[PDB]
């Protein structure tokens, strides 16, 4: 679970 597209 990442905090947005910018990973």
């Amino acid at each position, epitope marked *: *679970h990442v905090p947005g*597209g910018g990973s």
Partner: antibody, heavy 119, light 113 residues
Framework: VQLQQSGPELVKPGTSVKMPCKAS????????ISWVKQRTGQGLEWIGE????????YYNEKFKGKATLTADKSSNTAYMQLSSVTSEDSAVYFC?????????????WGQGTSVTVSS | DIVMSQSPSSLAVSAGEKVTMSCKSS????????????LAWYQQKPGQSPKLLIY???TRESGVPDRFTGSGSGTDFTLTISSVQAEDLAVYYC????????FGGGTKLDIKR
């Protein structure tokens, strides 16, 4: 695909409210549920998100310690709980399905639970 | 901790006219994830729940008509409606999803007849 929220709720100052968002028409564990606030005549305001596969959450700084985002894989239901509520929390609250992984966009929204905080 | 700014706050046009509105981010919305800017546009008609119109800065969501066209890159983005209809009466918000999420404060569309 559908997201079904509870009906309008009156709650007392200082107390809690927990509202559900019952999901259907898709794989519950393949998407995130995000939650959005909207005060009478105001803009939209993001509260946070929950990834049901893992239970993990994110929060707008604003809503840390106020809003507790939970979920239930077995019944495909996400919940948001507000604690120690005030007149500030009186608003319409949406749940929305966020296509985490690509769009990162909220393609489907619930009908919104209208919460009024007053005694 | 990213902020979104929309302008103009309000807009009015006659049915058939073209309209344009602007959304600016305090930082870049682009990534290593393909050309992708993580920016979306949402429509809210009075009494109704929001509707996703555009994601990835430019891509039409399914069931959104083609007269809605989003554009821009990095920190500057635009929604254009050609041939505005009476039914386009709404508030349009822009949203960042590059980090966490942040909505714009909306551009209200009024119709002149």
């Amino acid at each position: 695909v559908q997201l079904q929220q509870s009906g309008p709720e009156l709650v007392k100052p200082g107390t809690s409210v927990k509202m559900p968002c019952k999901a259907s028409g898709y794989i519950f564990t393949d998407y995130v549920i995000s939650w959005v606030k909207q005060r009478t005549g105001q803009g939209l305001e993001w509260i946070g998100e929950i990834f049901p596969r893992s239970g993990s959450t994110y929060y707008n700084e604003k809503f840390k310690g106020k809003a507790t985002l939970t979920a239930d894989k077995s019944s495909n239901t996400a919940y948001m709980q507000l604690s120690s509520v005030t007149s500030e929390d009186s608003a319409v609250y949406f749940c929305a399905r966020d296509y985490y992984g690509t769009s990162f966009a909220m393609d489907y929204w619930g009908q919104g639970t209208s919460v009024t905080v007053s005694s | 901790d990213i902020v979104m700014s929309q302008s103009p706050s309000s807009l009015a046009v006659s049915a058939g006219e073209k309209v344009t509105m602007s959304c600016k981010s305090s930082q870049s919305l682009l990534n290593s994830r393909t050309r992708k800017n993580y920016l979306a546009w949402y429509q809210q008609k009075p009494g109704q729940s929001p509707k996703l119109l555009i994601y990835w800065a430019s891509t039409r969501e399914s069931g959104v008509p083609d007269r809605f066209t989003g554009s821009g890159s990095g920190t500057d983005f635009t929604l254009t409606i050609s041939s505005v209809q009476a039914e386009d009466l709404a508030v349009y918000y822009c949203k960042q999803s590059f980090y966490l999420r942040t909505f714009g404060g909306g551009t209200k569309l009024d119709i002149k007849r």
